[PDB]
């Protein structure tokens, strides 16, 4: 069943900021993943890379919050 997978869910969901801060992220990006802050953009964007995924998923962006 949950072979150290529900644990990983707990990491992303909780440290997101709670039910609200996991749902809004999910609601906006249609997926929730774990990476490291590669660098903060000049325009509020935030870049995340994680070699755990593959090339399509390797690197990704969370756009500026004010873009609803």
Partner 1 sequence: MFYMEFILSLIGSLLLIICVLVSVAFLTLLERKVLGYIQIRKGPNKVGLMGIPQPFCDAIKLFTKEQTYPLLSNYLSYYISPIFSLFLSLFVWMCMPFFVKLYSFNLGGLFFLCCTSLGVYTVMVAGWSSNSNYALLGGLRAVAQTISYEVSLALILLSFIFLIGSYNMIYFFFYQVYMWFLIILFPMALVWVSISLAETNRTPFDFAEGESELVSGFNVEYSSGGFALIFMAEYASILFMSMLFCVIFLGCDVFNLLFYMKLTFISFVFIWVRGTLPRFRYDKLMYLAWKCFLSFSLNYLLFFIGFKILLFSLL
Partner 2 sequence: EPKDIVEVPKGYVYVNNKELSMEFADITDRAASTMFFGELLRGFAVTLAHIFKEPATINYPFEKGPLSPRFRGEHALRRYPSGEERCIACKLCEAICPAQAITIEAEERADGSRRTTRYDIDMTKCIYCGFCQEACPVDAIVEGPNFEFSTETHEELLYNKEKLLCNGDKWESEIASNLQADHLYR
Ligand X SMILES: CCCCCCCCCCCCCCCCCC(=O)OC[C@H](COP(=O)(O)OCCN)OC(=O)CCCCCCCCCCCCCCCCC
Instruction: Write down the least CB distance from residue 6 to partner 2, Å.
Output: 19
Q: Does 31 bind ligand X (CB under 6 A)?
A: no
Q: Does 55 bind ligand X (CB under 6 A)?
A: no
Measured from the CB atom, is 23 or 63 closer to partner 1? 23
User: Buried b / exposed e across 50-66, counting CB within 10 Å, b at 16+?
Assistant: eeeeeeeeeebebeeee
Identify whether the C-beta of residue 15 lies closer than 8 Å to the C-beta of residue 36. Answer: no
Residues that bind partner 1 (CB under 8 A): 23, 26-27, 30-31
């Amino acid at each position: 069943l949950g072979i150290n997978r529900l644990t990983k869910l707990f990491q992303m969901v909780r440290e997101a900021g709670g039910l609200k801060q996991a749902y809004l992220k999910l609601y906006r990006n249609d997926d929730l993943k774990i990476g490291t802050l590669v660098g903060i953009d000049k325009y509020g964007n935030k870049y995340f890379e994680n070699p755990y995924y593959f090339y399509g998923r390797n690197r990704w962006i969370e756009f500026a919050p004010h873009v609803n």
